[PDB]
Every structure is written in structure tokens, then in C-alpha cells.
Amino acid sequence: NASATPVKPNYALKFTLAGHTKAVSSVKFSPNGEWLASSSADKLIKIWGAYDGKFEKTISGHKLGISDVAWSSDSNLLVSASDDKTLKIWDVSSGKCLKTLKGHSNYVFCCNFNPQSNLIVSGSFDESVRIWDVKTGKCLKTLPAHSDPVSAVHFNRDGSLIVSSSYDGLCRIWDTASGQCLKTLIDDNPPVSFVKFSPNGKYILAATLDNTLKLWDYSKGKCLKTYTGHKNEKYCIFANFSVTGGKWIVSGSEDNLVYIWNLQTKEIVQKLQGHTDVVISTACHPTENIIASAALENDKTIKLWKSDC
Ligand SMILES: Cc1cc(=O)c(C(=O)NCc2c(F)cc(-c3ccccc3)cc2F)nn1-c1cccnc1
């Protein structure tokens, strides 16, 4: 009683990046592919070579831990989101703080530039989404987005839309220009710990704290794919579309592994072993089949992985 008679990636460890003194929170590749930025509970941002993993510099100034970091499209600026209730805009070359973005009334959890990089979007424990002017550092809009902390914020491919997620169990799609809510994605209502648009902007990938990732057609409000087998019941774990080779979904996990799924078949195709604590963050290199992963305080390292597809 059995059946009658696709390629997988082969990610392998290349480098372990040590230096953070507390849990890592977020890793992001620069758009130019040259750098990896890491944020940590240790209040620091570190910059590493994306290709050889070589430590470049520490950027300091936040008064408390950092949950997230994000690059401008020209790779020249970073924004960071901190428990000190601020975001900071950094000149990466000089390491200098250009602007402190003040307005959130509690921890800032998540941040992103728009592709244009004239705006920053932030989400906070204060349950709001804010849109900031990069040039002036002024808050342009406060969206009453959620009824629990905002876990993720992301612009789509042309900057016209924002997606937000919250532990309130909702994903919302916002019109950037007006700040008006275009769509709420909702029955079981598990907390939403992470969301991002697909690179093509047609789909959103949402992580829920029932050990599940789902690919939504948000226009149709229909779930097209489900990815599971990993552990996620507590943390905001960054997930990704890997598009440089085979079409994969990449995520961290509370079982200390990096999970890679076939986007179409939803099968687990790789589990990357090596981290010694929760893998809180994954990132995919913009041009090469390279993954960065980072872990919580029993580990505190970033790992770089390479695949042939
Ligand atoms: C060039 C390019 C290549 C990509 O692989 C993607 C992208 O989004 N890939 C993820 C992806 C997919 F591979 C397939 C499905 C899917 C789901 C159900 C049924 C049928 C298909 C959904 C997905 F989200 N995007 N771009 C891109 C990049 C920048 C601006 N425009 C486009």
C-alpha cells in the first residue's frame, strides 16, 4: 500500500559572527548586498561584511535594547527601533545619529523605509503605526492600527501600501498617502507575530503564534499556502521569500533551527542546525543564495549560510 513508482537548496554554514553581548533581535542585508546589519538587546547595531562575515563597526546611542533595524534603498542610512520609545536614523559611513524620531509612548518594535526611502514606518507596543519624514524626522501620520502591540510593518514594492500585524490577531493593509485602512485580514484569530509583502506585492506572508506561516492573497482575502512543522508560540520571528534561486520560504524557529520550505509544495526542504537558542531572525541576500540567521541570549551569534540554488 504505497504510491506508484523538484530540486532542494543545500544551505551550508560559512561563518559565525560573534560580538553581541545579549540576544540578537534582527539582521538585514543592505540593498547593495555588501553589508549585514544586526540589532540587539545589548543596545547596539553591528555592521558585518555580507560575503566574508568580517566585523566592520558598532553603532551606538540607543538608551535601551533594539528590536529592529532597516536600510535605506541607497544602503547609506539605517533606522533602528528601540525600547527607549524612539527610532534613530543613522549615517552608516560615519556611524552618527542624524535624527531621533520621538512620538511613540512605549517600546518601538518594528521599522522599515519605503523603497523611495523618504519615509519610515514604525510599529510600537503602544498599538500605533507611525509614518515619519526621513528629511525632517517629523511624524507625518499616527494610525490607530491595532488593539495590541504591533509586531511588524512593511511597505510594498512601490511604497503605495503598508502591511501591519499585531498580537491582536489581525493583519491590516494601509494606503501610505492617506493612512486609511484598505483591508483587514481575519476566525481562529491567533496572535500575528510577523508579516511582510511578497516581493511581487500580490501576497502577504503572516506568522501566527500557533506554529504556522500562511501566504495570503490579501486582495481576495484568501489563504493560498500554509507552512508548519517549526515552533513559534512566543516571539516575533522574521520570515522571508527567498527568490535568488529556488522559490523558498525561510523562517527562524523556537526549536533553534532555520526552516526552509518549498513555497509551492509547502514541504520542508531544509532545517539548518547550529544555533543554540531560538532563531529570532532570518534574512535573504538580495542577489546571492545567502541566508543570515540570528539567535537569542544562550547563543547571541549571527550565522551566514550559502546554497547552490
Ligand atoms: C522578480 C520576482 C521574482 C519572485 O520570485 C517574486 C516573488 O514575489 N516570489 C515569491 C512568490 C512566488 F515565487 C510564487 C507565488 C505564488 C503563489 C501561489 C500561486 C502562484 C505563485 C507567490 C510568491 F509570493 N517577486 N519578484 C519580484 C521582485 C520585485 C518586484 N516584482 C516582482
DSSP 174: E
Atom of ligand 1 nearest to the CA of 243: 5
CB 68 within 8 A of CB 62: no
| Amino acid type, 308 | D
Show me where the domains of the chain are located. 1-309
Resolution of this deposited model, Å: 1.3
Atom of ligand 1 nearest to the CA of 202: 24
Q: Give the SS3 label for residue 128.
A: coil
* Alpha-carbon gap, residue 298 to 256, rounded angstroms: 11
Neighbour order of strands in the sheet with 55-59: 24-29, 35-40, 45-49, 55-59
User: Which residue, by CA, sits nearest to atom 20 of ligand 1?
Assistant: 264
263 within ligand 1 shell (Cβ under 6 A): yes
* Alpha-carbon gap, residue 166 to 206, rounded angstroms: 10
- CA angle, 40 then 297 then 261, to 5°: 85
115 to 40, 106, 118: CA distances (angstroms): 24, 26, 8
Closest CA to 190 of 165, 222, 164, 223: 165
User: Which residue, by CA, sits nearest to atom 16 of ligand 1?
Assistant: 264
| Amino acid type, 223 | C
What is the best residue among 156, 200, 215 to mutate for testing ligand 1's pocket, by most ligand atoms within 8 Å of CB?
Answer: 200
98 to 93, 119, 167: CA distances (angstroms): 12, 15, 32
What is the best residue among 156, 247, 261 to mutate for testing ligand 1's pocket, by most ligand atoms within 8 Å of CB?
Answer: 247
Paired residues of 55 in beta bridges: 48
126 to 97, 145, 168, 258: CA distances (angstroms): 24, 10, 13, 30
136 Rama class: left (phi>0) / alpha (psi -120 to 50) / beta: alpha
User: Which residue, by CA, sits nearest to atom 5 of ligand 1?
Assistant: 243
> Residue holding cell 520570515?
239
Q: Which three cell numbers stand for residue 51?
A: 560575503
199 within ligand 1 shell (Cβ under 6 A): yes
* Alpha-carbon gap, residue 87 to 64, rounded angstroms: 11
Ligand 1 centroid – CA 147 distance (Å): 31
CB 171 within 8 A of CB 162: no
171 to 97, 132, 146, 154, 277: CA distances (angstroms): 32, 21, 9, 11, 28
* Alpha-carbon gap, residue 281 to 37, rounded angstroms: 12
- Burial label for 225, CB within 10 Å (0-12, 13-18, 19+), is middle
* Alpha-carbon gap, residue 213 to 255, rounded angstroms: 15
b/e sequence 239-270, b meaning 16+ C-beta within 10 Å: bbbbeeebebbbbbbbbbbbbbbbbeebebbb
Question: What technique solved it?
Answer: X-ray
| Other CB atoms within 10 A of residue 226 CB | 11
CB 3 within 8 A of CB 279: no
